[PDB]
Structures are given as structure tokens and as C-alpha cells.
Amino acid sequence: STGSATTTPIDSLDDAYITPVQIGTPAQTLNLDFDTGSSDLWVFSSETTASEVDGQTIYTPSKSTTAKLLSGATWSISYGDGSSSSGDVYTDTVSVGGLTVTGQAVESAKKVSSSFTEDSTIDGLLGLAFSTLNTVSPTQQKTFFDNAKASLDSPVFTADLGYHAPGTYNFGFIDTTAYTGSITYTAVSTKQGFWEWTSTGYAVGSGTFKSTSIDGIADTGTTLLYLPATVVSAYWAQVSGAKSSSSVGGYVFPCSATLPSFTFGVGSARIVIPGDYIDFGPISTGSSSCFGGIQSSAGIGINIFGDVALKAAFVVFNGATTPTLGFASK
């Protein structure tokens, strides 16, 4: 089997991407944030504290003839950005782009933190990291991909995120028309439960390529590109007037600037992030200080190849017995 679904930016900055997902019988369609950096499929629901729901579409398990309470199961997650959610668990039928999994753990939120409430466009998350990170207790549950894997034509999914435009998540096949040149594959460590890999280096603008190993995670659920302070400083030094602002929470730059591109290495191959992808707009409405899309990972504890990086590529998440990651230009 295969599936194919369009993923759409939630706003004009590509802060996140939402993909429609069918849950239950009859189908209830929710717009979920597909997140290769976590492993829980959780939704706003009829059980979510009412004051914490503000415009989201909810899953109502009592209206699904295929929903079953997973007795005794609870979940609770805290994300790297400080947000969180928790609740109980149903199993139900979940379909993405024509690909159906029966008995998928659907984690129903009883509580969500303010950042979730305040984002009316995101109805929940669909985790696509390794199932070892799933938070359900006392019986850990599998991701949608893990459940689908054996039935897929090939044990893969691909992320093709757009810049200020829709893109695609495919399951079970590689669309050879969606990228240019060849796909370069690189090793993955699953030791921390992430799609963790090692970039071979970087360049800033038209500058020379610096060969240096950068361990990090391919994370569709993180907006920006978080890299070591040395790398980030070298980038922003090429933008007149750019500076790290402790009050704002990262590097800012004059909105009048033209940003240089940023290149990262995948083996001997190179992915070029155009400068415009690194512009996250005014820090507050009307400001002439703009927020940068490349930021320091110092104090995160891990480097993160988030949407800024991934949207410059066609990315293969290869879930074969030994997982790997593939990147192509597009």
C-alpha cells in the first residue's frame, strides 16, 4: 500500500505545516502537525478542558463506531519548545492520504499548554520519530508509520515541504518526479529515538565549504535550523547589522537586509537553503528588526535540522531494518 497527502503551511512564515488525517468511523478529519521529532499521535478532543480549546477541530471518540478506550493508558509529553499536553488513549482507524491503519493509538488530550490553545490551525500532532519515544504508559504504543510499515510497498516515508507553498508527505514510495539529481543517503542513529544523522559541513553564501561533522536530527516539527554557535556566528557575521539579542531570544537582523544562502553537506552532496528561507519577518508587528531562521543550538543539547533546512530538500525517511536518511535537491 501507499499514501500521499498534501501538507500546508499554517501561516505566511511557514511556522509549521498541517496535513489532513481521517480518524474514526465515520471519518473525522483533523489537521495534524506531522512531527519527525516525536512519537505520539495526539489530538484535541471532546475530552479536552473546554477553556483550553479555541477554534481547533476536535476528535469525539463517542461518535466513532471503531473507537475503543485503551483501558488504563495515559500519556504526557513535553516538547523542546516548552509546550506540553496529556490525556488518555483510544485505538481507532486512522488514514493519511489513502493509507489506512486499524488499531492506531489516538491519544486524546485532556490538557494542553497555552501555545497549543493559541494556535487554532493545529488540531494535534502525528509523531514520526521512533516508537521508543512514545509516552503512553503503562504500555508504549507504536507510531502510525511503525504500524503501517509492513503493509507499505517500501518501508519509507518522504517529506517534501514547500517554501511559502504546500508540499507533500508520501508513505510507501519515492516519487522520482519530485526531486532533481540523485538522492544521497546517510547513516542514522536511533539511540536517542530520533532521525539523527551527521552532516559533513556547511558554507555561507558563496563562501568556501567547511568540512566538519555536525550531528543533528531531521525534525519536521521544529520551525528553524538550530546549529552550533560557531556555525551560526559565521552565518550572521555576513549580514550587516545582525546581532544576537538576549531580549528577543536569538539572532535578529535588519529587515532591509538581503540574506545569504546557507549550504549543508550530506555526504559529498550539498543542499542549498536560499537566503529568503532564513527570513522569519518582523519580531513584532511593524518592527524593522527581523527574526533569523538559523539560531544557536547551545543549551538545547542537540542540533536540529528543522523546517528551514528540510524544506530546501526532498527528504527520505527510510525505515528499513537499518534506518537511513536521504536528501535530494528539488
CSV table of C-alpha atoms in Angstrom, one decimal:
chain,number,residue,atom,x,y,z
A,1,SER,CA,0.0,0.0,0.0
A,2,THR,CA,0.9,3.7,-0.2
A,3,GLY,CA,-0.4,7.0,0.9
A,4,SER,CA,0.0,10.6,-0.3
A,5,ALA,CA,-1.2,13.7,1.5
A,6,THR,CA,-0.7,17.4,0.9
A,7,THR,CA,0.9,19.4,3.8
A,8,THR,CA,0.1,23.1,4.0
A,9,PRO,CA,1.9,26.0,5.9
A,10,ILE,CA,-0.2,27.3,8.8
A,11,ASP,CA,0.7,30.9,8.2
A,12,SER,CA,2.7,33.2,5.9
A,13,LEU,CA,6.0,32.4,7.7
A,14,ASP,CA,5.8,28.6,7.4
A,15,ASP,CA,5.8,28.4,11.2
A,16,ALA,CA,4.5,24.8,10.9
A,17,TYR,CA,2.7,22.6,8.4
A,18,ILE,CA,-0.7,20.8,8.7
A,19,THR,CA,-1.8,17.6,7.0
A,20,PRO,CA,-5.4,16.3,7.0
A,21,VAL,CA,-5.9,13.0,8.8
A,22,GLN,CA,-9.0,10.9,8.9
A,23,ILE,CA,-9.8,9.4,12.3
A,24,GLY,CA,-12.6,7.1,13.2
A,25,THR,CA,-15.8,5.8,11.6
A,26,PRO,CA,-17.4,7.8,10.0
A,27,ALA,CA,-14.2,9.8,9.4
A,28,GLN,CA,-13.4,12.8,11.5
A,29,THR,CA,-10.8,14.9,9.6
A,30,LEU,CA,-8.3,16.7,11.8
A,31,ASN,CA,-5.4,18.8,10.6
A,32,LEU,CA,-2.3,17.4,12.3
A,33,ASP,CA,1.3,18.6,12.6
A,34,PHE,CA,3.5,15.7,11.3
A,35,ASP,CA,6.5,15.7,13.6
A,36,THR,CA,9.6,13.5,12.8
A,37,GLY,CA,11.0,14.7,16.2
A,38,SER,CA,8.4,13.0,18.4
A,39,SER,CA,6.4,9.8,18.5
A,40,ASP,CA,2.9,10.5,19.9
A,41,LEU,CA,-0.3,10.9,17.8
A,42,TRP,CA,-2.4,13.2,19.9
A,43,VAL,CA,-5.5,15.2,19.2
A,44,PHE,CA,-7.7,17.9,20.6
A,45,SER,CA,-10.9,16.1,21.6
A,46,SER,CA,-14.2,16.1,23.3
A,47,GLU,CA,-12.3,15.4,26.5
A,48,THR,CA,-10.0,18.5,26.2
A,49,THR,CA,-10.6,21.0,29.0
A,50,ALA,CA,-13.1,23.5,27.4
A,51,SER,CA,-11.1,26.6,28.3
A,52,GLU,CA,-8.1,25.2,26.5
A,53,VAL,CA,-9.9,24.8,23.2
A,54,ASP,CA,-10.0,27.8,20.9
A,55,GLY,CA,-11.0,27.1,17.3
A,56,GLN,CA,-9.5,23.6,16.9
A,57,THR,CA,-11.4,20.8,15.4
A,58,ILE,CA,-11.9,18.0,18.0
A,59,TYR,CA,-12.0,14.3,17.8
A,60,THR,CA,-15.1,12.8,19.5
A,61,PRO,CA,-14.5,9.1,20.2
A,62,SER,CA,-18.1,8.5,21.3
A,63,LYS,CA,-19.1,9.3,17.7
A,64,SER,CA,-16.8,6.7,16.2
A,65,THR,CA,-18.1,3.2,15.9
A,66,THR,CA,-14.5,1.9,15.7
A,67,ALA,CA,-13.1,3.8,18.7
A,68,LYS,CA,-12.2,1.7,21.8
A,69,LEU,CA,-10.8,3.0,25.1
A,70,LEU,CA,-7.3,1.7,25.7
A,71,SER,CA,-8.0,0.8,29.3
A,72,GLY,CA,-5.7,2.3,31.9
A,73,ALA,CA,-3.5,4.0,29.3
A,74,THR,CA,-2.4,7.6,29.8
A,75,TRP,CA,0.1,9.9,28.1
A,76,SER,CA,2.0,13.1,28.9
A,77,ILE,CA,4.5,14.9,26.7
A,78,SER,CA,6.8,17.9,27.0
A,79,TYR,CA,8.3,19.3,23.8
A,80,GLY,CA,11.7,21.1,23.4
A,81,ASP,CA,9.9,24.5,23.0
A,82,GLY,CA,8.4,24.2,26.5
A,83,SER,CA,4.9,23.2,25.3
A,84,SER,CA,3.0,20.2,26.6
A,85,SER,CA,-0.1,18.1,26.6
A,86,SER,CA,-1.5,15.0,28.3
A,87,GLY,CA,-4.6,12.7,28.5
A,88,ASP,CA,-5.9,9.2,27.9
A,89,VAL,CA,-5.9,6.9,24.8
A,90,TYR,CA,-8.2,5.3,22.3
A,91,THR,CA,-7.5,2.9,19.5
A,92,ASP,CA,-9.2,3.8,16.2
A,93,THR,CA,-8.8,3.7,12.4
A,94,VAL,CA,-6.5,6.4,11.1
A,95,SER,CA,-6.0,7.2,7.4
A,96,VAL,CA,-3.4,9.5,5.8
A,97,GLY,CA,-3.7,10.2,2.1
A,98,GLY,CA,-5.5,6.9,1.4
A,99,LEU,CA,-3.3,4.8,3.7
A,100,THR,CA,-5.2,3.2,6.5
A,101,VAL,CA,-4.1,1.8,9.8
A,102,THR,CA,-6.5,0.0,12.1
A,103,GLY,CA,-5.9,-0.1,15.8
A,104,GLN,CA,-3.8,3.1,15.9
A,105,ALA,CA,-3.3,4.6,19.3
A,106,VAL,CA,-5.0,8.0,19.2
A,107,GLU,CA,-4.0,10.0,22.3
A,108,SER,CA,-6.9,12.2,23.4
A,109,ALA,CA,-5.9,15.4,25.1
A,110,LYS,CA,-7.4,16.2,28.5
A,111,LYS,CA,-5.0,19.2,28.9
A,112,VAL,CA,-2.9,21.2,26.5
A,113,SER,CA,-0.5,24.1,27.2
A,114,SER,CA,-1.2,27.6,26.2
A,115,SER,CA,0.8,27.6,22.9
A,116,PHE,CA,-1.4,24.8,21.6
A,117,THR,CA,-4.6,26.5,22.6
A,118,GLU,CA,-3.5,29.7,21.0
A,119,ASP,CA,-2.8,28.0,17.6
A,120,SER,CA,-6.2,27.5,16.1
A,121,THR,CA,-4.8,25.8,13.0
A,122,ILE,CA,-3.2,22.8,14.6
A,123,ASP,CA,-5.6,20.0,15.8
A,124,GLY,CA,-2.9,17.8,17.2
A,125,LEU,CA,0.4,16.1,16.3
A,126,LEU,CA,1.3,12.9,14.4
A,127,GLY,CA,4.7,11.7,15.6
A,128,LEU,CA,7.0,10.1,13.1
A,129,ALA,CA,10.2,9.6,15.2
A,130,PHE,CA,10.9,6.1,16.6
A,131,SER,CA,8.3,4.4,18.7
A,132,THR,CA,10.8,4.1,21.6
A,133,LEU,CA,10.0,7.8,22.4
A,134,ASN,CA,6.2,7.2,22.6
A,135,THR,CA,4.9,8.4,26.0
A,136,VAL,CA,1.9,6.1,26.5
A,137,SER,CA,2.0,4.3,29.9
A,138,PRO,CA,2.0,1.6,31.0
A,139,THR,CA,2.1,0.1,27.5
A,140,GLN,CA,4.1,2.1,25.0
A,141,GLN,CA,2.4,2.5,21.6
A,142,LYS,CA,3.6,2.5,18.0
A,143,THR,CA,3.6,5.4,15.6
A,144,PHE,CA,1.4,5.5,12.5
A,145,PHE,CA,4.4,4.8,10.4
A,146,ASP,CA,5.6,1.8,12.5
A,147,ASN,CA,2.1,0.3,12.3
A,148,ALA,CA,1.8,0.9,8.6
A,149,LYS,CA,5.3,-0.2,7.7
A,150,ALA,CA,4.9,-3.9,7.0
A,151,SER,CA,2.0,-3.2,4.6
A,152,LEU,CA,3.8,-0.4,2.7
A,153,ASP,CA,5.2,-1.2,-0.8
A,154,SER,CA,8.6,0.1,0.6
A,155,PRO,CA,9.2,0.8,4.3
A,156,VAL,CA,9.7,4.6,3.8
A,157,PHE,CA,8.0,7.9,4.1
A,158,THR,CA,9.1,11.2,2.4
A,159,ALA,CA,8.8,14.9,3.4
A,160,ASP,CA,8.6,17.5,0.6
A,161,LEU,CA,7.9,20.7,2.5
A,162,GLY,CA,7.2,23.9,0.5
A,163,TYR,CA,8.6,27.3,0.9
A,164,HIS,CA,5.5,29.6,1.3
A,165,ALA,CA,3.6,26.8,-0.5
A,166,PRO,CA,2.0,23.4,0.0
A,167,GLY,CA,4.1,20.2,-0.2
A,168,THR,CA,3.6,16.5,0.3
A,169,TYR,CA,4.1,13.6,2.7
A,170,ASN,CA,4.2,10.2,0.9
A,171,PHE,CA,4.2,6.8,2.6
A,172,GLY,CA,5.5,3.7,1.0
A,173,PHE,CA,7.1,5.0,-2.2
A,174,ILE,CA,9.6,7.5,-3.5
A,175,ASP,CA,8.2,9.9,-6.1
A,176,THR,CA,11.1,10.2,-8.6
A,177,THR,CA,9.5,13.2,-10.2
A,178,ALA,CA,9.6,15.3,-7.0
A,179,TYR,CA,13.4,16.0,-6.9
A,180,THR,CA,16.3,16.8,-9.2
A,181,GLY,CA,19.5,14.9,-9.5
A,182,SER,CA,20.1,11.9,-7.1
A,183,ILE,CA,19.2,11.2,-3.5
A,184,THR,CA,22.2,10.9,-1.2
A,185,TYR,CA,21.7,8.6,1.7
A,186,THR,CA,23.4,8.9,5.1
A,187,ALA,CA,23.5,6.9,8.2
A,188,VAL,CA,21.1,7.2,11.1
A,189,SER,CA,21.5,6.6,14.8
A,190,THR,CA,18.3,5.6,16.6
A,191,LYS,CA,19.9,5.6,20.0
A,192,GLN,CA,18.0,8.7,21.2
A,193,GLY,CA,14.9,7.8,19.3
A,194,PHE,CA,15.3,10.5,16.6
A,195,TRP,CA,16.2,10.5,12.9
A,196,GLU,CA,19.8,11.5,14.0
A,197,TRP,CA,22.5,11.9,11.4
A,198,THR,CA,25.8,13.7,10.8
A,199,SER,CA,26.1,16.5,8.3
A,200,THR,CA,29.5,16.8,6.6
A,201,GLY,CA,29.8,20.6,6.9
A,202,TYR,CA,28.5,23.9,5.7
A,203,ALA,CA,29.0,27.0,3.6
A,204,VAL,CA,27.7,30.6,4.0
A,205,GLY,CA,26.6,32.3,0.8
A,206,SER,CA,29.2,31.8,-2.0
A,207,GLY,CA,31.9,31.1,0.6
A,208,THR,CA,34.1,28.0,0.8
A,209,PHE,CA,32.7,24.8,2.2
A,210,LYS,CA,33.9,24.0,5.7
A,211,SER,CA,34.3,20.2,6.3
A,212,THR,CA,33.1,19.5,9.8
A,213,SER,CA,30.9,16.9,11.4
A,214,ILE,CA,27.6,18.2,12.7
A,215,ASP,CA,25.4,15.7,14.5
A,216,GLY,CA,21.7,16.6,14.5
A,217,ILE,CA,18.1,15.5,14.0
A,218,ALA,CA,15.8,15.7,11.0
A,219,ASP,CA,12.8,17.3,12.6
A,220,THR,CA,9.7,18.4,10.6
A,221,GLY,CA,8.1,19.6,13.8
A,222,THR,CA,10.7,22.3,14.5
A,223,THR,CA,10.4,25.5,12.5
A,224,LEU,CA,14.0,26.7,12.5
A,225,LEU,CA,17.5,25.4,11.9
A,226,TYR,CA,19.5,25.1,15.1
A,227,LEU,CA,23.2,24.7,14.8
A,228,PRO,CA,26.4,25.1,16.9
A,229,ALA,CA,27.2,28.6,18.0
A,230,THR,CA,30.4,28.7,15.9
A,231,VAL,CA,28.4,27.9,12.7
A,232,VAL,CA,25.6,30.3,13.5
A,233,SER,CA,28.0,33.2,14.3
A,234,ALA,CA,29.8,32.6,11.0
A,235,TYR,CA,26.5,32.9,9.1
A,236,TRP,CA,25.2,36.1,10.8
A,237,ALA,CA,28.6,37.8,10.5
A,238,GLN,CA,27.8,38.0,6.8
A,239,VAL,CA,24.7,40.1,7.4
A,240,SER,CA,25.3,43.8,8.2
A,241,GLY,CA,23.7,44.8,11.4
A,242,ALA,CA,22.8,41.3,12.6
A,243,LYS,CA,23.2,40.5,16.2
A,244,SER,CA,22.2,38.1,18.9
A,245,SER,CA,19.5,39.6,21.1
A,246,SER,CA,19.0,38.1,24.6
A,247,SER,CA,15.8,40.1,25.0
A,248,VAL,CA,14.3,38.8,21.7
A,249,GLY,CA,15.7,35.2,22.2
A,250,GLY,CA,18.1,34.8,19.3
A,251,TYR,CA,19.7,36.4,16.2
A,252,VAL,CA,17.9,39.3,14.7
A,253,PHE,CA,18.8,41.3,11.6
A,254,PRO,CA,17.7,44.5,9.8
A,255,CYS,CA,14.6,43.8,7.7
A,256,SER,CA,16.2,45.8,4.9
A,257,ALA,CA,19.0,43.1,4.5
A,258,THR,CA,19.4,40.6,1.7
A,259,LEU,CA,20.2,37.3,3.4
A,260,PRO,CA,22.9,34.9,2.1
A,261,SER,CA,22.2,31.3,1.4
A,262,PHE,CA,23.3,28.5,3.7
A,263,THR,CA,24.6,25.2,2.4
A,264,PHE,CA,24.8,22.0,4.4
A,265,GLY,CA,26.6,18.8,3.5
A,266,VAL,CA,25.0,15.3,3.1
A,267,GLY,CA,28.0,13.1,2.4
A,268,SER,CA,29.6,14.5,-0.6
A,269,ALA,CA,26.4,16.2,-1.7
A,270,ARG,CA,25.2,19.7,-0.8
A,271,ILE,CA,21.8,21.2,0.0
A,272,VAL,CA,21.4,24.9,-0.5
A,273,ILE,CA,19.0,26.9,1.6
A,274,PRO,CA,18.2,30.1,-0.2
A,275,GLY,CA,18.5,33.3,1.9
A,276,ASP,CA,14.8,34.1,1.8
A,277,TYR,CA,14.1,30.8,3.6
A,278,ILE,CA,16.0,32.2,6.6
A,279,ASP,CA,13.7,35.3,7.0
A,280,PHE,CA,11.1,35.0,9.7
A,281,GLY,CA,9.9,38.5,9.5
A,282,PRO,CA,9.4,41.3,12.0
A,283,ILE,CA,10.0,40.4,15.6
A,284,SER,CA,6.7,42.2,16.4
A,285,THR,CA,4.2,43.8,14.0
A,286,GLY,CA,5.6,46.9,12.4
A,287,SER,CA,9.2,46.4,13.6
A,288,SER,CA,12.2,46.8,11.3
A,289,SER,CA,14.1,44.1,13.2
A,290,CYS,CA,13.5,40.7,11.7
A,291,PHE,CA,13.9,37.2,13.3
A,292,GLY,CA,16.5,34.8,11.9
A,293,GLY,CA,15.8,31.3,10.7
A,294,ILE,CA,19.2,30.0,11.7
A,295,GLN,CA,19.7,30.0,15.5
A,296,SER,CA,22.2,28.6,18.0
A,297,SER,CA,21.5,25.1,19.5
A,298,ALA,CA,23.7,25.9,22.5
A,299,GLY,CA,21.6,24.9,25.5
A,300,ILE,CA,19.2,22.8,23.5
A,301,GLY,CA,21.7,19.9,23.8
A,302,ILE,CA,21.2,18.8,20.2
A,303,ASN,CA,21.4,20.3,16.7
A,304,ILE,CA,18.1,20.4,14.9
A,305,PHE,CA,17.6,20.3,11.1
A,306,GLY,CA,14.1,21.8,11.2
A,307,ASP,CA,11.8,23.1,8.5
A,308,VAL,CA,14.2,25.8,7.3
A,309,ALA,CA,16.6,23.1,6.3
A,310,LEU,CA,14.2,20.3,5.3
A,311,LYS,CA,12.1,22.4,3.0
A,312,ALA,CA,15.1,23.0,0.8
A,313,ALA,CA,15.2,19.3,0.1
A,314,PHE,CA,13.3,16.2,-0.8
A,315,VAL,CA,13.9,14.0,2.3
A,316,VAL,CA,13.6,10.2,2.6
A,317,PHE,CA,12.9,8.7,6.0
A,318,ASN,CA,14.0,5.1,5.3
A,319,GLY,CA,12.6,2.8,7.9
A,320,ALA,CA,14.3,-0.4,6.7
A,321,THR,CA,15.8,-2.7,9.3
A,322,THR,CA,18.8,-0.4,9.4
A,323,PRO,CA,17.2,3.1,9.0
A,324,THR,CA,18.8,5.8,6.9
A,325,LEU,CA,18.0,9.3,5.7
A,326,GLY,CA,18.1,10.5,2.1
A,327,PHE,CA,18.4,14.1,0.8
A,328,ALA,CA,17.9,15.4,-2.7
A,329,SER,CA,17.8,18.9,-4.1
A,330,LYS,CA,14.5,19.9,-5.8
